[PDB]
């Protein structure tokens, strides 16, 4: 039937479309589409100095990435361990190298074809319109970045992802009022997204920025998930049952 014909609103690089024909339930707005973090509750030094593409292993920036990821076509390499996620640092302002260097795939935007849509058991959810390639960046988790004492006064939290820093601080993306596609991707036992700390420029290591990864191949109509991880089900996980209905769920 067709609700939306963008739910981002223009403030992505292409629309996203709202779809329900499993009610009549209509499409979301009591949040506000953001396509970069809303920030509520020294040196900036962190680049390389290539004349490069950043192609070399000279790229100090992707030296902090263990090293550079990114295939010449903006995904990652069989070689990076979906399994255990390193950090990855992008190119920035400070560096050297053009704005169009290979290390440099979050910073420019969404590219994927996505819909939000209804699902008939799991409330909203995001799926793509296009075979998303394994690796590929598909979207950022941004929300409005609150501190661990914010959270702890929030009512609804299902919308929260955690910024686990082993040093007490502990700091969260609420994705409720303010947020992105993102806020609307489900829950799976078996993930075909997988989250990946990336830092840009003006951030320290508390700080990161969640971007999600395609796993494996996400076939044109699949529905996008991501692990939500101990955390989650430990709260949510007694006011219902995972609905995933997947051959290895566990919770
Ligand atoms: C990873 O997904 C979740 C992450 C969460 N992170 C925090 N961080 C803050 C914890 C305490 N401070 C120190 C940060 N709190 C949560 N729930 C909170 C549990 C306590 N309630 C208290 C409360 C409930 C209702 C009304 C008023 C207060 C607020 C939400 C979370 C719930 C999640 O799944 C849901
Ligand atoms: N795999 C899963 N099984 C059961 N509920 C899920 C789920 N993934 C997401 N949810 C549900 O969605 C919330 C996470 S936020 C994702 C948005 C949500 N589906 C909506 O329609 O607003 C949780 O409160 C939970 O009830
Ligand atoms: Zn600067
Ligand atoms: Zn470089
Ligand atoms: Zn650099
Ligand atoms: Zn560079
Ligand atoms: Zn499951």
């Given at each position: 039937?067709?609700?939306?014909?963008?739910?981002?609103?223009?403030?992505?690089?292409?629309?996203?479309?709202?779809?329900?024909?499993?009610?009549?339930?209509?499409?979301?707005?009591?949040?506000?589409?953001?396509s970069q973090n809303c920030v509520t509750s020294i040196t900036h030094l962190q680049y390389c100095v290539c004349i490069d593409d950043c192609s070399s292993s000279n790229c100090m920036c992707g030296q902090?990435?263990?090293?550079?990821?990114?295939?010449?076509?903006?995904?990652?390499?069989?070689?990076?361990?979906?399994?255990?996620?390193?950090?990855?640092?992008?190119?920035?302002?400070?560096?050297?190298?053009?704005?169009?260097?290979?290390?440099?795939?979050?910073?420019?935007?969404?590219?994927?074809?996505?819909?939000?849509?209804?699902?008939?058991?799991?409330?909203?959810?995001?799926?793509?319109?296009?075979?998303?390639?394994?690796?590929?960046?598909?979207?950022?988790?941004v929300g409005e970045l609150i501190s661990d004492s914010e959270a702890d006064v929030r009512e609804e939290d299902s919308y929260l992802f955690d910024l686990d820093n082993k040093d007490g601080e502990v700091?969260?993306?609420?994705?409720?009022?303010?947020?992105?596609?993102?806020?609307?991707?489900?829950?799976?036992?078996?993930?075909?997204?997988?989250?990946?700390?990336?830092?840009?420029?003006?951030?320290?290591?508390?700080?990161?920025?969640?971007?999600?990864?395609?796993?494996?191949?996400?076939?044109?109509?699949?529905?996008?998930?991501?692990?939500?991880?101990?955390?989650?089900?430990?709260?949510?996980?007694?006011?219902?049952?995972?609905?995933?209905?997947?051959?290895?769920?566990?919770?």
């Open positions: 039937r067709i609700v939306s014909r963008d739910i981002a609103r223009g403030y992505e690089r292409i629309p996203i479309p709202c779809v329900n024909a499993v009610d009549s339930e209509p499409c979301p707005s009591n949040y506000k589409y953001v902090l990435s263990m090293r550079c990821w990114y295939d010449k076509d903006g995904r990652l390499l069989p070689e990076f361990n979906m399994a255990e996620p390193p950090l990855i640092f992008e190119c920035n302002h400070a560096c050297s190298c053009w704005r169009n260097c290979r290390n440099r795939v979050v910073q420019n935007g969404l590219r994927a074809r996505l819909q939000l849509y209804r699902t008939r058991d799991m409330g909203w959810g995001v799926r793509s319109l296009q075979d998303i390639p394994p690796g590929t960046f598909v979207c950022e988790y700091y969260c993306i609420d994705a409720r009022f303010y947020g992105n596609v993102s806020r609307f991707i489900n829950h799976h036992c078996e993930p075909n997204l997988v989250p990946v700390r990336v830092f840009m420029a003006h951030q320290d290591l508390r700080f990161p920025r969640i971007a999600f990864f395609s796993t494996r191949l996400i076939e044109a109509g699949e529905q996008l998930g991501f692990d939500y991880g101990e955390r989650f089900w430990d709260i949510k996980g007694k006011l219902f049952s995972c609905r995933c209905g997947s051959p290895k769920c566990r919770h």
